[PDB]
Amino acid sequence: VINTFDGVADYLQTYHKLPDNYITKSEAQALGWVASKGNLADVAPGKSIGGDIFSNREGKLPGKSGRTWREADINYTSGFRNSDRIVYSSDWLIYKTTDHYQTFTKIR
């Protein structure tokens, strides 16, 4: 699967889309994912959550009109979601967070 910072960052700026192992939260729930039981890997084998819009209300990510932030989970294999996310924009800017969106650093 493609689910590393560099792998997803590079796929995204190229293909302008997420790798095929990503599914949205509502998609995952439709299949039976229940966040409380950390069972993603049981109902959606080899899938990661990714593609949901990140609103950016604590203004920490660079704002602009026409720009939309989207997030994807990084390094997940199974169990409960980790704290790693890739935050990507409409204009292909790429940021990462390894602390549940407290702090962000630019990667692309």
Short mmCIF file of N, CA and C in Angstrom, two decimals:
data_model
loop_
_atom_site.label_atom_id
_atom_site.label_comp_id
_atom_site.label_asym_id
_atom_site.label_seq_id
_atom_site.Cartn_x
_atom_site.Cartn_y
_atom_site.Cartn_z
N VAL A 1 0.84 -1.23 0.00
CA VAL A 1 0.00 0.00 0.00
C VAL A 1 0.86 1.27 0.00
N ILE A 2 0.27 2.30 -0.54
CA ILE A 2 1.05 3.58 -0.49
C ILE A 2 0.47 4.38 0.69
N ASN A 3 1.16 4.48 1.79
CA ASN A 3 0.69 5.21 3.00
C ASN A 3 1.76 5.84 3.89
N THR A 4 2.85 6.24 3.27
CA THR A 4 3.97 6.92 3.91
C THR A 4 3.90 8.40 3.49
N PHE A 5 4.49 9.25 4.31
CA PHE A 5 4.52 10.73 4.05
C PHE A 5 4.99 11.10 2.63
N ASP A 6 6.14 10.51 2.30
CA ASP A 6 6.77 10.75 0.99
C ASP A 6 6.02 10.08 -0.16
N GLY A 7 5.54 8.87 0.08
CA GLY A 7 4.83 8.17 -0.99
C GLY A 7 3.53 8.79 -1.39
N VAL A 8 2.81 9.21 -0.34
CA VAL A 8 1.49 9.82 -0.59
C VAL A 8 1.78 11.23 -1.09
N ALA A 9 2.66 11.96 -0.39
CA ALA A 9 2.98 13.34 -0.94
C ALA A 9 3.29 13.37 -2.44
N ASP A 10 4.18 12.53 -2.89
CA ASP A 10 4.59 12.39 -4.30
C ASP A 10 3.41 11.90 -5.12
N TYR A 11 2.66 10.90 -4.74
CA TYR A 11 1.51 10.52 -5.56
C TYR A 11 0.57 11.67 -5.80
N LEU A 12 0.20 12.37 -4.75
CA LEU A 12 -0.72 13.51 -4.77
C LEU A 12 -0.45 14.69 -5.69
N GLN A 13 0.79 15.08 -5.87
CA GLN A 13 1.27 16.21 -6.68
C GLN A 13 1.41 15.86 -8.18
N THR A 14 1.45 14.55 -8.33
CA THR A 14 1.52 13.93 -9.64
C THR A 14 0.12 13.70 -10.25
N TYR A 15 -0.57 12.73 -9.69
CA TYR A 15 -1.90 12.26 -10.07
C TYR A 15 -3.03 13.13 -9.51
N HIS A 16 -2.70 14.03 -8.59
CA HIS A 16 -3.78 14.91 -8.10
C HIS A 16 -4.96 14.15 -7.50
N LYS A 17 -4.59 13.02 -6.95
CA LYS A 17 -5.62 12.14 -6.32
C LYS A 17 -4.91 11.27 -5.28
N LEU A 18 -5.73 10.71 -4.40
CA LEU A 18 -5.13 9.84 -3.36
C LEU A 18 -4.97 8.46 -3.98
N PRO A 19 -4.09 7.69 -3.36
CA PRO A 19 -3.86 6.27 -3.71
C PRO A 19 -5.23 5.64 -3.38
N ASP A 20 -5.44 4.48 -3.92
CA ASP A 20 -6.65 3.67 -3.92
C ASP A 20 -6.95 2.88 -2.66
N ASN A 21 -6.01 2.94 -1.74
CA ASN A 21 -6.17 2.33 -0.41
C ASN A 21 -6.80 3.40 0.51
N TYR A 22 -7.26 4.52 0.05
CA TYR A 22 -7.86 5.51 0.95
C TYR A 22 -9.38 5.50 0.84
N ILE A 23 -10.10 5.71 1.91
CA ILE A 23 -11.56 5.73 1.85
C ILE A 23 -11.98 6.84 2.81
N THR A 24 -13.07 7.49 2.56
CA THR A 24 -13.49 8.56 3.47
C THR A 24 -14.09 7.97 4.73
N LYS A 25 -14.27 8.86 5.70
CA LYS A 25 -14.84 8.40 6.98
C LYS A 25 -16.24 7.80 6.78
N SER A 26 -17.10 8.54 6.10
CA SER A 26 -18.47 8.03 5.85
C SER A 26 -18.49 6.75 5.01
N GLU A 27 -17.51 6.59 4.13
CA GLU A 27 -17.40 5.37 3.32
C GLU A 27 -17.10 4.13 4.21
N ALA A 28 -16.15 4.38 5.12
CA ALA A 28 -15.65 3.45 6.13
C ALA A 28 -16.84 3.11 7.05
N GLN A 29 -17.60 4.02 7.55
CA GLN A 29 -18.75 3.76 8.40
C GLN A 29 -19.80 2.91 7.66
N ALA A 30 -19.96 3.23 6.39
CA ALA A 30 -20.91 2.45 5.57
C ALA A 30 -20.51 0.98 5.61
N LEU A 31 -19.27 0.60 5.52
CA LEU A 31 -18.73 -0.74 5.57
C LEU A 31 -18.72 -1.34 6.97
N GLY A 32 -19.09 -0.58 7.99
CA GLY A 32 -19.04 -1.15 9.32
C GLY A 32 -17.95 -0.68 10.26
N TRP A 33 -17.14 0.33 9.93
CA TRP A 33 -16.06 0.85 10.75
C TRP A 33 -16.72 1.56 11.94
N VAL A 34 -16.28 1.28 13.11
CA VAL A 34 -16.82 1.87 14.35
C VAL A 34 -15.53 2.32 15.05
N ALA A 35 -15.29 3.63 15.09
CA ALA A 35 -14.09 4.25 15.65
C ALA A 35 -13.72 3.74 17.04
N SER A 36 -14.70 3.49 17.88
CA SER A 36 -14.60 3.03 19.27
C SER A 36 -14.05 1.66 19.45
N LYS A 37 -14.28 0.82 18.43
CA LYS A 37 -13.71 -0.52 18.52
C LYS A 37 -12.42 -0.65 17.71
N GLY A 38 -11.89 0.33 17.06
CA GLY A 38 -10.70 0.32 16.22
C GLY A 38 -10.66 -0.82 15.24
N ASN A 39 -11.72 -1.15 14.56
CA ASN A 39 -11.87 -2.32 13.68
C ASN A 39 -11.78 -2.09 12.19
N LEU A 40 -11.20 -0.96 11.79
CA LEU A 40 -11.06 -0.56 10.38
C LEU A 40 -10.48 -1.68 9.56
N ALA A 41 -9.38 -2.25 10.05
CA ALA A 41 -8.70 -3.32 9.32
C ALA A 41 -9.61 -4.55 9.21
N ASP A 42 -10.53 -4.76 10.10
CA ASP A 42 -11.43 -5.90 9.97
C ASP A 42 -12.51 -5.58 8.92
N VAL A 43 -13.04 -4.42 8.79
CA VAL A 43 -14.14 -4.27 7.82
C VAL A 43 -13.75 -3.77 6.44
N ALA A 44 -12.55 -3.21 6.39
CA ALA A 44 -11.92 -2.59 5.20
C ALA A 44 -10.44 -2.93 5.16
N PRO A 45 -10.23 -4.22 4.92
CA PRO A 45 -8.87 -4.76 4.83
C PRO A 45 -8.04 -3.95 3.83
N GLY A 46 -6.83 -3.60 4.27
CA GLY A 46 -5.84 -2.83 3.53
C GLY A 46 -6.10 -1.39 3.16
N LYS A 47 -7.11 -0.75 3.68
CA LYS A 47 -7.62 0.59 3.58
C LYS A 47 -7.25 1.40 4.86
N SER A 48 -7.13 2.68 4.57
CA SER A 48 -6.78 3.79 5.47
C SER A 48 -7.85 4.89 5.31
N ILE A 49 -8.11 5.74 6.31
CA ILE A 49 -9.07 6.80 6.12
C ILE A 49 -8.34 7.97 5.42
N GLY A 50 -8.92 8.68 4.46
CA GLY A 50 -8.23 9.78 3.80
C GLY A 50 -9.14 10.44 2.78
N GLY A 51 -9.06 11.69 2.45
CA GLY A 51 -9.93 12.32 1.47
C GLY A 51 -10.97 13.24 2.10
N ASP A 52 -11.17 13.31 3.39
CA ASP A 52 -12.13 14.15 4.07
C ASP A 52 -11.55 15.57 4.09
N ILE A 53 -12.38 16.57 3.99
CA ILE A 53 -11.98 17.97 4.01
C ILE A 53 -11.59 18.30 5.44
N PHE A 54 -10.50 19.01 5.57
CA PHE A 54 -10.02 19.43 6.91
C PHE A 54 -10.46 20.90 6.95
N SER A 55 -11.27 21.34 7.89
CA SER A 55 -11.68 22.75 7.79
C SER A 55 -10.58 23.72 8.15
N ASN A 56 -9.64 23.51 9.04
CA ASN A 56 -8.66 24.62 9.22
C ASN A 56 -9.19 25.78 10.05
N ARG A 57 -10.19 25.52 10.89
CA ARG A 57 -10.72 26.63 11.70
C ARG A 57 -9.73 27.16 12.71
N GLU A 58 -8.64 26.54 13.13
CA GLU A 58 -7.77 27.21 14.12
C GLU A 58 -6.72 28.05 13.34
N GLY A 59 -7.07 28.41 12.11
CA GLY A 59 -6.30 29.13 11.13
C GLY A 59 -4.85 28.71 10.95
N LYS A 60 -4.32 27.68 11.59
CA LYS A 60 -2.92 27.28 11.48
C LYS A 60 -2.42 26.92 10.09
N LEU A 61 -3.22 26.49 9.14
CA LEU A 61 -2.74 26.17 7.78
C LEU A 61 -2.98 27.40 6.90
N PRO A 62 -2.06 27.75 6.05
CA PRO A 62 -2.23 28.92 5.15
C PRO A 62 -3.51 28.90 4.33
N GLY A 63 -4.38 29.85 4.58
CA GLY A 63 -5.68 30.14 3.98
C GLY A 63 -5.44 30.88 2.65
N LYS A 64 -6.46 30.91 1.83
CA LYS A 64 -6.52 31.53 0.50
C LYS A 64 -7.89 31.22 -0.09
N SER A 65 -8.37 32.06 -1.02
CA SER A 65 -9.74 31.78 -1.57
C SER A 65 -9.50 30.87 -2.77
N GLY A 66 -10.35 29.87 -2.78
CA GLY A 66 -10.25 28.87 -3.87
C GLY A 66 -9.51 27.70 -3.21
N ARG A 67 -8.87 28.04 -2.09
CA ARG A 67 -8.17 26.86 -1.47
C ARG A 67 -8.98 26.19 -0.38
N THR A 68 -8.93 24.89 -0.45
CA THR A 68 -9.52 23.82 0.32
C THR A 68 -8.52 22.81 0.87
N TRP A 69 -8.58 22.62 2.18
CA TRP A 69 -7.64 21.62 2.74
C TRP A 69 -8.24 20.24 2.83
N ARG A 70 -7.47 19.20 2.52
CA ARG A 70 -7.94 17.79 2.68
C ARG A 70 -6.90 17.00 3.51
N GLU A 71 -7.35 16.06 4.33
CA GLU A 71 -6.44 15.26 5.14
C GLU A 71 -6.43 13.79 4.78
N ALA A 72 -5.43 12.99 5.07
CA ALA A 72 -5.27 11.56 4.82
C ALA A 72 -4.45 11.02 6.01
N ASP A 73 -4.74 9.83 6.49
CA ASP A 73 -4.05 9.14 7.58
C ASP A 73 -2.72 8.60 7.05
N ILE A 74 -1.65 8.64 7.77
CA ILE A 74 -0.32 8.18 7.37
C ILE A 74 0.15 7.05 8.30
N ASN A 75 0.87 6.10 7.75
CA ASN A 75 1.40 4.98 8.52
C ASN A 75 0.35 4.05 9.15
N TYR A 76 -0.88 3.97 8.68
CA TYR A 76 -1.80 3.08 9.38
C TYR A 76 -1.79 1.68 8.80
N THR A 77 -1.89 0.70 9.67
CA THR A 77 -1.98 -0.68 9.20
C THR A 77 -3.18 -1.26 9.93
N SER A 78 -3.33 -1.05 11.22
CA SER A 78 -4.51 -1.70 11.86
C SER A 78 -4.75 -1.21 13.27
N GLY A 79 -5.90 -1.57 13.83
CA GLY A 79 -6.13 -1.03 15.22
C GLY A 79 -6.77 0.35 15.07
N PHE A 80 -6.71 1.17 16.09
CA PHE A 80 -7.19 2.51 16.24
C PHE A 80 -6.33 3.42 15.36
N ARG A 81 -6.84 4.51 14.84
CA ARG A 81 -6.06 5.50 14.05
C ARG A 81 -5.01 6.11 14.97
N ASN A 82 -3.88 6.41 14.33
CA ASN A 82 -2.65 6.98 14.91
C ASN A 82 -2.85 8.49 14.84
N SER A 83 -1.77 9.21 15.09
CA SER A 83 -1.80 10.67 15.10
C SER A 83 -1.21 11.38 13.92
N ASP A 84 -0.83 10.60 12.93
CA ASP A 84 -0.19 11.06 11.70
C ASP A 84 -1.13 11.40 10.56
N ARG A 85 -1.06 12.61 10.04
CA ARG A 85 -1.92 13.02 8.94
C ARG A 85 -1.14 13.78 7.90
N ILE A 86 -1.54 13.77 6.68
CA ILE A 86 -0.94 14.50 5.53
C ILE A 86 -2.07 15.53 5.32
N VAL A 87 -1.75 16.81 5.15
CA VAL A 87 -2.84 17.82 4.99
C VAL A 87 -2.48 18.33 3.59
N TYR A 88 -3.35 18.29 2.60
CA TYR A 88 -3.01 18.73 1.23
C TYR A 88 -3.99 19.81 0.76
N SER A 89 -3.53 20.70 -0.13
CA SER A 89 -4.45 21.76 -0.61
C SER A 89 -4.84 21.49 -2.07
N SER A 90 -5.76 22.36 -2.50
CA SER A 90 -6.28 22.40 -3.86
C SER A 90 -5.10 22.73 -4.82
N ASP A 91 -4.20 23.56 -4.31
CA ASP A 91 -3.08 23.92 -5.20
C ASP A 91 -1.82 23.10 -4.94
N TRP A 92 -1.94 21.88 -4.52
CA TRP A 92 -0.89 20.93 -4.22
C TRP A 92 0.14 21.34 -3.17
N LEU A 93 -0.26 22.14 -2.18
CA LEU A 93 0.72 22.34 -1.10
C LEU A 93 0.55 21.08 -0.17
N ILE A 94 1.65 20.63 0.37
CA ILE A 94 1.66 19.49 1.28
C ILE A 94 2.36 19.73 2.63
N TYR A 95 1.55 19.47 3.63
CA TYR A 95 1.94 19.58 5.04
C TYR A 95 1.76 18.26 5.77
N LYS A 96 2.46 18.16 6.90
CA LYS A 96 2.26 16.95 7.70
C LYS A 96 2.09 17.44 9.14
N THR A 97 1.50 16.56 9.91
CA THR A 97 1.26 16.65 11.36
C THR A 97 1.46 15.24 11.95
N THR A 98 2.17 15.10 13.02
CA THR A 98 2.32 13.77 13.66
C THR A 98 1.76 13.93 15.08
N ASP A 99 0.96 15.00 15.31
CA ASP A 99 0.43 15.23 16.64
C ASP A 99 -1.05 15.62 16.71
N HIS A 100 -1.80 14.97 15.82
CA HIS A 100 -3.22 15.28 15.83
C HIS A 100 -3.51 16.73 15.53
N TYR A 101 -2.95 17.26 14.45
CA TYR A 101 -3.13 18.62 13.95
C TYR A 101 -2.82 19.79 14.89
N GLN A 102 -2.05 19.52 15.90
CA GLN A 102 -1.67 20.66 16.80
C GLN A 102 -0.72 21.64 16.04
N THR A 103 0.32 21.02 15.52
CA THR A 103 1.46 21.49 14.76
C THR A 103 1.63 20.86 13.39
N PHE A 104 2.04 21.68 12.44
CA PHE A 104 2.28 21.32 11.04
C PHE A 104 3.58 21.81 10.44
N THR A 105 4.22 21.05 9.64
CA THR A 105 5.43 21.38 8.92
C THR A 105 5.14 21.07 7.42
N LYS A 106 5.66 21.94 6.57
CA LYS A 106 5.60 21.84 5.14
C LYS A 106 6.48 20.68 4.60
N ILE A 107 6.01 19.81 3.71
CA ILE A 107 6.81 18.72 3.18
C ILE A 107 6.93 18.75 1.66
N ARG A 108 6.01 19.36 0.97
CA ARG A 108 6.04 19.60 -0.50
C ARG A 108 5.55 21.05 -0.71
#
